């Protein structure tokens, strides 16, 4: 990554062993559950394109997702080139060349070129742009790998209401959708898919019950 | 977060892998026991609003609580805008814009804007304001997840007084996230919910009792 140093200057630092091992482990333990996307963004703070590629390449399994991810990156790279084409010409001594889509993805650029763009004034943040594409790709994978549709999330007979509600909003997170959808869906399926012992209680609470009030109300069913 | 470096100047630092794992793990192991609120506050020392959102977003389970937390944050954002509305106008070269409720929550602000507010003179501490809102939300969750009402904590016949008292103040701690009178209920219910042989001893103690003196008496 690129870090602040003790003086004001921005310098390169090797990716740390702690971060690499942490990323490999979260993938092993959580696969492509939605919470992995935030962790990736935090672990890749300040990353060069090289560092981001290392993190993705150290994943051993899930090669279908990884190959699918490569496809999404290439689609975004092509769109970059179309909206920001490279101005062709002889390069002036000491001036930077213009990054192509493939340079941002770290495939045809060197570490020194990547550092050059990121430390320019004004900075050309090839690392931050690539991370955007990777996160766009991971979002698609989490949605594909969501195992259950909310329509199939129904409260079990002995299941505590908190656990059904936990499952409900976890599925919504992978499904992502929108906030309008998340609030329309709650006003609908959460009550109908509730257990009958809880359903009677939730129905008796009346209209306008908060999520907080229903979970307190239903703490007796066990 | 924003920290002081070896020179006097305040610079941004990446959230550490150690801190992120620590927060994820304490939630997995301890859930919403009251002591998690301290831990969050310490782990979020110097945090930007982005960092606070990162910590909350990396939590995988407990999505009911997280959705409840979002409601509390949104409620707090509206009150911020109502008491500190944004003065509208063209922005002067090199001056910062005024933060809205959504900017404090890290939804509509950039990292650089967050850093700008936190390091200004005078500082606009958007990180500290957001952390307060999050803690208000977490307090409600801890209380909701309190498994027992204080009224139902009663000493077993074979339970050492120390173990009952440990359970008693833990439950009291979960209700209202401590930060209460902590005195009216104590002078009353702790004795009434004591075991029968101990209750006679506690009743016999008389007015004024230290926690220390009563536990010794019932040893």
């Amino acid at each position, epitope marked *: 990554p690129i870090v602040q140093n003790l003086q004001g200057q921005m310098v390169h630092q090797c990716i740390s062993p702690r971060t690499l091992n942490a990323w490999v482990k979260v993938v092993e333990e959580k696969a492509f559950s939605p919470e992995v996307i935030p962790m990736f963004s935090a672990l890749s703070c300040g990353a060069t394109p090289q560092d981001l590629n290392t993190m993705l390449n150290t994943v051993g399994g899930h090669q279908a997702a990884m190959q699918m991810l490569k496809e999404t990156i290439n689609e975004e790279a092509a769109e970059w080139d179309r909206l920001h084409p490279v101005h062709a010409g002889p390069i002036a001594p000491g001036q930077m060349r213009e990054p192509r889509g493939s340079d941002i993805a770290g495939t045809t650029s060197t570490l020194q070129e990547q550092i050059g763009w990121m430390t320019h004034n004004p900075p050309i943040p090839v690392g931050e742009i690539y991370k955007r594409w990777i996160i766009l790709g991971l979002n698609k994978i989490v949605r594909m790998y969501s195992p259950t549709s909310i329509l199939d999330i129904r409260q079990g007979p002995k299941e505590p209401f908190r656990d059904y509600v936990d499952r409900f909003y976890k599925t919504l997170r992978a499904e992502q959708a929108s906030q309008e959808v998340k609030n329309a869906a709650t006003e609908t399926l959460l009550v109908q898919n509730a257990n009958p*012992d809880c359903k*009677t209680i939730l129905k008796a*609470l009346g209209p306008g019950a908060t999520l907080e009030e229903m979970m307190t109300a239903c703490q*007796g069913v066990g | 977060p924003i920290v002081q470096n070896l020179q006097g100047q305040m610079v941004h630092q990446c959230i550490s892998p150690r801190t992120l794992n620590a927060w994820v793990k304490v939630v997995e192991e301890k859930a919403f026991s009251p002591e998690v609120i301290p831990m969050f506050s310490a782990l979020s020392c110097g945090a930007t609003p982005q960092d606070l959102n990162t910590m909350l977003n990396t939590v995988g389970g407990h999505q009911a609580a997280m959705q409840m937390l979002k409601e509390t944050i949104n409620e707090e954002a509206a009150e911020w805008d109502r008491l500190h509305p944004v003065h509208a106008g063209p922005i002067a070269p090199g001056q910062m814009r005024e933060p809205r409720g959504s900017d404090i929550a890290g939804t509509t602000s950039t990292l650089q804007e967050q850093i700008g507010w936190m390091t200004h003179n005078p500082p606009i501490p958007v990180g500290e304001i957001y952390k307060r809102w999050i803690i208000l939300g977490l307090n409600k969750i801890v209380r909701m997840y309190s498994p027992t*009402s204080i009224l139902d904590i009663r000493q077993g016949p074979k339970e050492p007084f120390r173990d009952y008292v440990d359970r008693f103040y833990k439950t009291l701690r979960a209700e209202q996230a401590s930060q209460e009178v902590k005195n009216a209920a104590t002078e009353t219910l702790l004795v009434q919910n004591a075991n029968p042989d101990c209750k006679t001893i506690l009743k016999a103690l008389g007015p004024g009792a230290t926690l220390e003196e009563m536990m010794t008496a019932c040893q």
Partner: nanobody
Amino acid sequence: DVQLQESGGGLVQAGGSLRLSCAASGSISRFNAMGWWRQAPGKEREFVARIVKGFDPVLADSVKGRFTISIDSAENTLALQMNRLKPEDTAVYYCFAALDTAYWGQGTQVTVS
């Protein structure tokens, strides 16, 4: 198991006040939520009041200004103080309490005019 019974209801004229009371078995602090619903002859059941543990009382909009709901743990009773009574208030009033599913009283008839 858990038994509920409303009482204190009857027929009063317009502009009067009345207090319904619902007696519960066991301790009332054990319930996680209680409230009041009503049904008038031929009309569908309408929601009147709710109190959930730890929360402020919530009242229906047609009654919000006029009714109050309270809980007395000493007498183990749930009170709905109907005040400023109107003709639309003629109905049967029910209390409910929820512990591991909900429970209803038999109702009390209230007729205003």
